[PDB]
Each structure stands twice: as structure tokens, then as C-alpha cells.
Amino acid sequence: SMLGADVSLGQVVITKNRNGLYYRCRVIGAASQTCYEVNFDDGSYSDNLYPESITSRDCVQLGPPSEGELVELRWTDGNLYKAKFISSVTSHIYQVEFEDGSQLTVKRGDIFTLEEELPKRVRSRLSL
């Protein structure tokens, strides 16, 4: 959900358009994304797992597993695998609109509020 979000709908923020220059733009959309972090038995891992893919537990109804718990999941290949659950992460993603009418979907890390200190990288390439 949008609980804990530090950016609101209608707020003016600064972000890089694909042209490399930074502009003032308006927040037109906002959404949350919840991903699980797991370590697969094959020695690899994921920080983007869909909570619905866990088959050993009904995570949508009962909530996430305990940290360190061995779980069973169904991978994108349609096969069952076991993995160690590590953590659950919820992040906030926004949609912005520039003065020319073009739009972009951005992570919170790529936007700057009009109150925070802008790095020199941003300040030198900032438009009027």
C-alpha cells in the first residue's frame, strides 16, 4: 500500500528525462511493489520474487514466511524448487509527467524532492 510514502499525488519533483537534462515534473501516478528475497538451492538468488509463487505456504492469505524458513516455490519455468526465504520488501514507484506532456515510470531513488540537497551532477544539468 501507500503507507509510509514520502511523495504524494500532484507533488512537483525533479527527474532526468531521457535527454540527460533534469526537469520539474508532476506526480500523476503512485503504486507499491512487494517482492520477497530468496536463496535458491542451485546457489543463485532473487530479490524480486512474486509472493504468489510460494507453494508450501499461502502467502497472500496468511502473510510471509519466517526469516530463514525453507520454502517450496513454482519458478517461471513451471517447475517446483526449494529455497530459503530471507526477507520481504515493499517499495514505492511513481509515474511523472513533464511540461511537454511526455510521461515516465520512476523509482523513488531516481526522483528528487524540491526540498532535498541536489548533487552537483543534477544541479549543473538542471533546466529553468
Given a contact cutoff of 8 angstroms between Cβ atoms, the answer to whether 52 and 35 are in contact is no
What is the resolution of the experimental data for this entry, in Å? 2.0
| CATH fit for domain 12-32+90-124, picks 2.30.30.140, 2.60.40.60, 3.20.19.10, 3.30.870.10 | 2.30.30.140
Distances 18 to 24, 79, 110, 111, 115 between C-alpha atoms, Å: 14, 39, 12, 13, 23
Amino acid identity, residue 43?
A: G
The answer regarding whether domain 35-89 maps to CATH 3.10.330.70 reads yes
Residue 114, exposed/middle/buried by CB under 10 A (0-12, 13-18, 19+)? exposed
* Dihedral over Cα of 103, 105, 109, 115: its sign: positive
Q: How far apart are the first and last CA of the chain?
A: 34
91: cell is 517499495
Phi–psi pair at 110, nearest 5 degrees: -95, 0
Residue with cell 524458513: 69
Experimentally, the structure was elucidated by X-ray
3-state helix, strand, coil in the chain (%, to 5): 10, 50, 40
Given a contact cutoff of 8 angstroms between Cβ atoms, the answer to whether 85 and 69 are in contact is yes
7 half-sphere exposure, CB direction, 13 A CA radius: 28
Residue with cell 520481504: 88
